[PDB]
A paper describes a structure:
In addition to the protein kinase fold, [name] has a C-terminal tail (residues 331–372) with a largely nonconserved sequence. Using kinetic analysis of a human P-TEFb complex consisting of [name] and cyclin T, we show that the [name] C-terminal tail sequence is important for the catalytic mechanism and imposes an ordered binding of substrates and release of products.
The resulting crystal structure, solved at 3.6 Å resolution, shows unambiguous electron density for the inhibitor and 11 additional [name] C-terminal residues as compared with the structure of CDK9FL/cyclin T259. Phe336 inserts into a hydrophobic pocket just before the hinge, and Glu337 inserts into the ATP binding site. Taken together, our results suggest that the bound state of the C-terminal tail and the associated kinase conformation observed in the CDK9FL/cyclin T259/[name] complex represents a conformation that is adopted during the reaction cycle. We propose that the [name]-bound structure of [name]/cyclin T reported here represents a short-lived conformational state that is adopted during the phosphorylation cycle. The C terminus transiently folds over the ATP binding site, thereby stabilizing the N- and C-terminal kinase lobes and promoting ATP binding.
Residue numbers in the entry:
A (entry chain A): 6 to 88, 96 to 338
B (entry chain B): 8 to 259
């Protein structure tokens, strides 16, 4: 027979449409409420092996999405079952993502619009950080925008909660997180007591990506990355980055010794505005404790200069009526 | 919203189990029994009381939707616990929780062949049940407990260590023995725990310099009249519980 279930609707009440994102631990359809036409995104809980009942990392994600209710963070509407069995995460549908826009050449951003995007992106980071959450997966692909031009951070699959590390016991978080290209130096050198700044780095890589239309530092492996970074920010030394020696991989990874900071310069050609440059710079700072934070970044003169942040709705509609996603 | 898992006295009366032949009295004991099973298991599996409480809350809420006649306490508990453990950052391995559950319910029998079909089925059985639990709870697994406020609520009346201890005991037994957690917010239950703890320890909480009673600093909705009714129900069932009261009795 059947079991009572008042608080978990069958996913049948949504009509699948098209596979929109093929990320890791994410099989993302689009869907339509069979009654209201309301569009949603369905993330089916992978259960590849999971020989330990419901996937804990899934429980983690679920706890987090429920806690984050904010305008620049994706929205979990509910959770649905199938009646083996399957579990679906249901979110408010958003029509574009930053990856789909930056690649499509039919799309162009004015300086002011770009300002709004970053303003929205940094504000969202301020929120989650204020809620002691790390996103740990910063990349254009995980940044969505609705029809009405609202930016929303998404995919908290890798996200985890963080604590104030005192009592003489540094944290042991997982080290191999966030995509390679958008990954920060602290993690490559094998840090396990990292914090908010790791997402800020990601945010840096995105800023540039707004003008360059392409992930600025593409690396084959963790070694090719670290070099590629140093070839933009300069050489990793105790002079520029105090106590960077303590890492077991410091030069025990054959790091390139001769490099001077060539960030502003290598970018001037793409981004013209001197303010934008100055920000991208304080975001792509090597030493995490010297890298700019969500709060201060917002207060940067960039967000307060003649070309003031604009709303995006007009562009999105006039631009294309289609949704940009791989 | 935030009232879904809180019920009225009439609602508790007309439970899912009532509608299948179960007397109020019968049912309340099924709960206590499940709680006991949990407490026992959790100790053996070496999880925090916090975890065991979360389990107990899951169990309570669960049987406000499902009936004991369809789901026997003995099968739901291990699943509830298993879930609570993962949820609270103390995961226990599935086999590990089945073993312990077995020995508690059948202290004599020996564990089946971990290769047999019998065993494999009770493994699938628990995973299924944990699923049903998740669904019945609408995947709302973040729980808040009186103990959080009772550490802060005792600090608020500058209580003795003994009076504090005693308070926690009330707190935890309230969870096992009564359905308070299905009726009153954690803050409130904490007050009920402390009030009774005073009455038991012949401790008198001094009225504020204003005239306000200590509980108004915790949950405005709390009236002495209520506290007196709850502490009465709580003490009543405690007295019926063997050896329980003995643990806080002043013997000197």
């Amino acid at each position: 027979d059947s079991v009572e279930c008042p608080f978990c609707d069958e996913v049948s009440k949504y009509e699948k449409l098209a596979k929109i994102g093929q990320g890791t631990f994410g099989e993302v359809f689009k869907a339509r409420h069979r009654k209201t036409g309301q569009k949603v995104a369905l993330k089916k809980v992978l259960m590849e092996n999971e020989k330990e009942g419901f996937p804990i990392t899934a429980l983690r994600e679920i706890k987090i999405l429920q806690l984050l209710k904010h305008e620049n963070v994706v929205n979990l509407i509910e959770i649905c079952r199938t009646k083996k069995g399957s579990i679906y995460l249901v979110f408010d549908f958003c029509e574009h993502d930053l990856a789909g826009l930056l690649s499509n050449v039919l799309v162009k951003f004015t300086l002011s619009e770009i300002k709004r995007v970053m303003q929205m992106l940094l504000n969202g980071l301020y929120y989650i950080h204020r809620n002691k959450i790390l996103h740990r997966d910063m990349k254009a692909a995980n940044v969505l925008i609705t029809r009405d031009g609202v930016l929303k951070l998404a995919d908290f699959g890798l996200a985890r909660a963080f604590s104030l590390a005192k009592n003489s016991q540094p944290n042991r978080y997982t080290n191999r997180v966030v995509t390679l290209w958008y990954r920060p130096p602290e993690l490559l050198l094998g840090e396990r007591d990292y914090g908010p700044p790791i997402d800020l780095w990601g945010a840096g890589c995105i800023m540039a990506e707004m003008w360059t239309r392409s992930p600025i530092m593409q690396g084959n492996t963790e070694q090719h990355q670290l070099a590629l970074i140093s070839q933009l920010c300069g050489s990793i030394t105790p002079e520029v980055w105090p106590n960077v020696d303590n890492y077991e991989l410091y030069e025990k990874l054959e790091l390139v010794k001769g490099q001077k900071r060539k960030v502003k310069d290598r970018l001037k050609a793409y981004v013209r505005d001197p303010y934008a440059l100055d920000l991208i710079d304080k975001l792509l700072v090597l030493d995490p404790a010297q890298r700019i934070d969500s709060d201060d970044a917002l207060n940067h003169d960039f967000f307060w200069s003649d070309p003031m942040p604009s709303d995006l709705k007009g562009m999105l509609s006039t631009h294309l009526t289609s949704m940009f996603e791989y | 919203n935030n009232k879904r898992w809180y019920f009225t006295r009439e609602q508790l009366e007309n439970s899912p189990s009532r509608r299948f032949g179960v007397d109020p009295d019968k049912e309340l004991s099924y709960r206590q029994q499940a709680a006991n099973l949990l407490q026992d298991m959790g100790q053996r599996l070496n999880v925090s009381q916090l975890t065991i409480n979360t389990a107990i809350v899951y169990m309570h809420r669960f049987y406000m939707i499902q009936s004991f006649t369809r789901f026997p306490g003995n099968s739901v508990a291990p699943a509830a616990l298993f879930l609570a453990a993962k949820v609270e950052g103390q995961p226990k391995k599935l086999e590990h929780v089945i073993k312990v559950a077995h020995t508690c319910l059948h202290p004599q029998e020996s564990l089946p062949d971990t290769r047999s079909e019998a065993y494999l089925q009770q493994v699938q059985d628990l995973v299924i049940l944990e699923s049903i639990i998740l669904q019945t709870l609408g995947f709302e697994l973040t729980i808040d407990h009186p103990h959080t406020h009772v550490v802060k609520c005792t600090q608020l009346v500058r209580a003795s260590k003994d009076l504090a201890q005693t308070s926690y005991f009330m707190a935890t037994n309230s969870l096992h023995l009564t359905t308070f957690s299905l009726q009153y917010t954690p803050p409130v239950v904490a007050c009920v725990c402390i009030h009774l703890a005073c009455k038991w320890s012949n401790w008198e909480i001094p009225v504020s310099t204003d005239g306000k009673h200590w509980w108004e600093y915790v949950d405005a909705t709390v009236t002495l009249e209520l506290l007196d009714e709850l502490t009465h129900e709580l003490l009543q069932i405690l007295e019926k519980t063997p050896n329980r009261l003995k643990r806080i009795w002043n013997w000197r």
